[PDB]
C-alpha cells in the first residue's frame, strides 16, 4: 500500500543518508576514541594495581540516525564513582597519549568541566566533533534518594562533576539502549525518523521535536499499528498520530519510557508550538493522502537500512532486538 509514497520516502531517505566518506570518517574517529579510552582505562587500572567502567555510544551514532551534514558524535564514559574534575583532567590528558597507540591522526582534545565532558575534534573540514560525557550510575541513585527524602552519606571529593549534566548523560544512555531494543527492529521506524529528522530541520515548526521526542513519537505511533508498515504508510501514521491532537495541551503527550518519575517527552512545548506542529502535521497528512507527499518531504515529484557504522569491537555489547 502507498507504493508511490514508499518510493518518495525512500528517495528522500537516500538524499539525507550520510555519504560513505562521512561514515568512514565517523567509524574511524569513534573507533580511535573507543580504543584510546580503553587504553586510558587499562593505564588507570595498572596505575592502581574499575575506575572507568566502560564506554557506550549514545545519540545519533548509537541509534544509526546520522544524516548528511552531521558533525556531532557522542559517547558516554561510565565511571565506578561519581566522576570528578580530577578524573576528567586525568582522562583528557592520557587520552592524547593513548590516541598515538592507534592513530597518527591529530585530534584537538578539550575538556569542559561545566559540561562534565571531553570534546574531541578531528582536523577534517568540516571537523567531526565527538563529545565524551563522563557520568556514573551513582549520580542517578543520589538524585533518587534525595527526591525520596533520604539523606546522602557521601564523603565527596570537593570536585564531583555537575550532577545535572551527569544525569542527562545517563538519560541519553537509557535512550540509546531503549532505541536499540524497541525502535531499531521496528520496520520502517529508523527510516522514518531519519526523514522526519530532516523535516524538523527544514521546517522550524517541527524543530522542537528533534531528537528524543521524535524518536519516541515515531516508535509509538508506528508500533501501535497491528502490522509492519512500509516507509510510506509508516510516515503517514506518524502524521495521523500528530493530526489527532496527541501533542495538544489536553492530549496524553508522549510518556517517556526512560524516566521513573512520570515525564512527558514533549512537555517542553509551549501552547503555540503544540498548535503549530499539530496544524502542520494535519496539513501534511492530507497532502500525503492526496498524492502530494513530495511537498511534505521538500522534494520534487519523482518521474537492513539501520546500521550505519559497525558496532564497537572495543566495547562489544549484547544486541537486543525488537521481537519478530
Amino acid at each position: 500500500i502507498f507504493v508511490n509514497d514508499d518510493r518518495h520516502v525512500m528517495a528522500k531517505h537516500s538524499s539525507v543518508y550520510p555519504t560513505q566518506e562521512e561514515l568512514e570518517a565517523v567509524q574511524n574517529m569513534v573507533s580511535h576514541t573507543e580504543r584510546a579510552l580503553k587504553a586510558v582505562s587499562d593505564w588507570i587500572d595498572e596505575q592502581e594495581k574499575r575506575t572507568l567502567r566502560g564506554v557506550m555510544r549514545v545519540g545519533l551514532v548509537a541509534k544509526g540516525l546520522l544524516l548528511k551534514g552531521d558533525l556531532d558524535l557522542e559517547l558516554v564514559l561510565l565511571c565506578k564513582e561519581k566522576p570528578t574534575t580530577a578524573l576528567l583532567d586525568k582522562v583528557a590528558d592520557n587520552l592524547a597519549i593513548q590516541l598515538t597507540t592507534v592513530t597518527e591522526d591529530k585530534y584537538e582534545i578539550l575538556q569542559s568541566v561545566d559540561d562534565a565532558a571531553i570534546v574531541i575534534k578531528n582536523t577534517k573540514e568540516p571537523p567531526l566533533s565527538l563529545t565524551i560525557h563522563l557520568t556514573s550510575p551513582v549520580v542517578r541513585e543520589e538524585m533518587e534518594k534525595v527526591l525520596a527524602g533520604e539523606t546522602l552519606s557521601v564523603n565527596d571529593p570537593p570536585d564531583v562533576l555537575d550532577r545535572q549534566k551527569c544525569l542527562a548523560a545517563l538519560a541519553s544512555l537509557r535512550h540509546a539502549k531503549w532505541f536499540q531494543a524497541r525502535a531499531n527492529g521496528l520496520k520502517s521506524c529508523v527510516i522514518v525518523i531519519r526523514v522526519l529528522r530532516d523535516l524538523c530541520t527544514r521546517v522550524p515548526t517541527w524543530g522542537p521535536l528533534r531528537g528524543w521526542p521524535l524518536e519516541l513519537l515515531c516508535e509509538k505511533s508506528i508500533g501501535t499499528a497491528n502490522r509492519p508498515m512500509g516507509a510510506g504508510e509508516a510516515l503517514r501514521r506518524v502524521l495521523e498520530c500528530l493530526a489527532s491532537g496527541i501533542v495538544m495541551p489536553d492530549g496524553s503527550g508522549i510518556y517517556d519510557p526512560c524516566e521513573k518519575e512520570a515525564t512527558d517527552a514533549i512537555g517542553h512545548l509551549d501552547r503555540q508550538q503544540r498548535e503549530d506542529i499539530t496544524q502542520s502535521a494535519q496539513h501534511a497528512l492530507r497532502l500525503a493522502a492526496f498524492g502530494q507527499l513530495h511537498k511534505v518531504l521538500g522534494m520534487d515529484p519523482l518521474p537492513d537500512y539501520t546500521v550505519q557504522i559497525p558496532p564497537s569491537t572495543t566495547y562489544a555489547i549484547t544486541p537486543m532486538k525488537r521481537p519478530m
Binding site: 503517514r236 489527532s244 491532537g245 503555540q272 497528512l285 492526496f290
Partner: protein
C-alpha cells in the same frame, strides 16, 4: 487496507503523564445541547400518534387487502424516529412499505389515497394532507409528518423498467433504510450513541464543511466513537465527541483508509467513498480545525451555545493568546 491512527484504539500505548483536564463543564454542555435539540413532549406525542395510526392502517392492508389492488408485503419503521435520533423542529418519521407488486407512480398515488382516506374515515375531525413524492407519499397532520418510502420485493427489482416504475435508486435506498434500522436496533441501542448522533447532526448543520457526511455515515461514526474501544464500555459522551473529531482529523475518511466498512452491505464497502475526494479533504480539514479549537477550550462555540461559529472553520481565531489557523484545502483537481 490502511487503518488510520485512533488514540482510543491504543490508549494503553499512550499513558497520560498528568490526568486529563476536568471536562465537567463540557460534559454538562453536551447534555444541555442534547436537551435543546431533542424533540419536546408535544412533538413526541404527535409523531407517535400519526405513525401509530398510519402503521395500523397499513398493517391491516397487509392482512386484509380485500379488493385493493396495491398489495403490501411488509411495513417497517425506519430512520430517526425508529433509531431515536430525531431533532426538535423536524417532526418527521419514515416508514418503509414493501409492495408485492411493481411500484408504479399510479399504485403509489392509489396507496397514498387509500391510506389517508382510511384515516379520514376513522376520524373526520383530524385534518391531514397526503401528497405523493419521489420516494412514495407523505401524510401530514398540523404537527407531524410521516413519509412512506415505497419499495418492492427482490424479484421486482431486477425486473424493473425505468418507464413507469419509481426509480431504482429510491427503491434501493428504502431497502437500505430497513437494513440500517435493523443494524441500529441491534448494535447502536445505547443512550450515548443516540445522543452523540443527534449532536453530530447539529454539528454538521453548523459547520458546512461537514455537509458531505450523510445520515448513515453519521450513525456509523457515532456508533464507532462510543462503542469501538478496548474499555469494553461505551465511551463517555465528552470522550466520544472529541474522538469523532480526532478520528476524522486523523483521516478516517481519506484516500488509503479502510474508513468504516458498511455493515449493511456486501462485502466490504467503505462508507466514506460516497464522498468525492474534494469532499473527503474538506470533511477532514474541517475536523482538523475543530480538533484544535476544542483543545483550546472552544467547546461552547463548537456546540452552538455562543451563536454562529461557522467562521471558526475558515477564519483565524485566538484562544487565550494562542493563534489558530484553520486547516486549508489540500486536494487538487487532476
Amino acid at each position: 487496507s490502511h487503518i488510520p491512527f485512533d488514540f482510543y484504539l491504543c490508549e494503553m500505548a499512550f499513558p497520560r503523564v498528568k490526568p486529563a483536564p476536568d471536562e465537567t463543564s463540557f460534559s454538562e454542555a453536551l447534555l444541555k445541547r442534547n436537551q435543546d435539540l431533542a424533540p419536546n413532549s408535544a412533538e413526541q406525542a404527535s409523531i407517535l400518534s400519526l405513525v401509530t395510526k398510519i402503521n395500523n392502517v397499513i398493517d391491516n392492508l397487509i392482512v386484509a387487502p380485500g379488493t385493493f389492488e396495491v398489495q403490501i408485503e411488509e411495513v417497517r419503521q425506519v430512520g430517526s424516529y425508529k433509531k431515536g435520533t430525531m431533532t426538535t423542529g423536524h417532526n418527521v418519521a419514515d416508514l418503509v412499505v414493501i409492495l408485492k407488486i411493481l411500484p408504479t407512480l399510479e399504485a403509489v398515488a392509489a396507496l397514498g389515497n387509500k391510506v389517508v382516506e382510511s384515516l379520514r374515515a376513522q376520524d373526520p375531525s383530524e385534518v391531514l394532507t397526503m401528497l405523493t413524492n419521489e420516494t412514495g407519499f407523505e401524510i401530514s397532520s398540523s404537527d407531524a409528518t410521516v413519509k412512506i418510502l415505497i419499495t418492492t420485493v427482490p424479484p421486482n427489482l431486477r425486473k424493473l423498467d425505468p418507464e413507469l416504475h419509481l426509480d431504482i435508486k429510491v427503491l434501493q435506498s428504502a431497502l437500505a433504510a430497513i437494513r440500517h434500522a435493523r443494524w441500529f436496533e441491534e448494535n447502536a441501542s445505547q443512550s450515548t450513541v443516540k445522543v452523540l448522533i443527534r449532536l453530530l447532526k447539529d454539528l454538521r448543520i453548523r459547520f458546512p464543511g461537514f455537509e458531505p457526511l450523510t445520515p448513515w455515515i453519521l450513525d456509523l461514526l457515532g456508533h464507532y466513537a462510543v462503542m469501538n474501544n478496548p474499555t469494553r464500555q461505551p465511551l463517555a459522551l465528552n470522550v466520544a465527541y472529541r474522538r469523532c473529531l480526532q478520528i476524522l482529523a486523523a483521516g478516517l475518511f481519506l484516500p488509503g483508509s479502510v474508513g468504516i466498512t458498511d455493515p449493511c452491505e456486501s462485502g466490504n464497502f467503505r462508507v466514506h467513498t460516497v464522498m468525492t475526494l474534494e469532499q473527503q479533504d474538506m470533511v477532514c480539514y474541517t475536523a482538523q480545525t475543530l480538533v484544535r479549537i476544542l483543545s483550546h477550550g472552544g467547546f461552547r462555540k463548537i456546540l452552538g451555545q455562543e451563536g454562529d461559529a461557522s467562521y471558526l472553520a475558515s477564519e483565524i481565531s485566538t484562544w487565550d493568546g494562542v493563534i489558530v489557523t484553520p486547516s486549508e484545502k489540500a486536494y487538487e483537481k487532476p
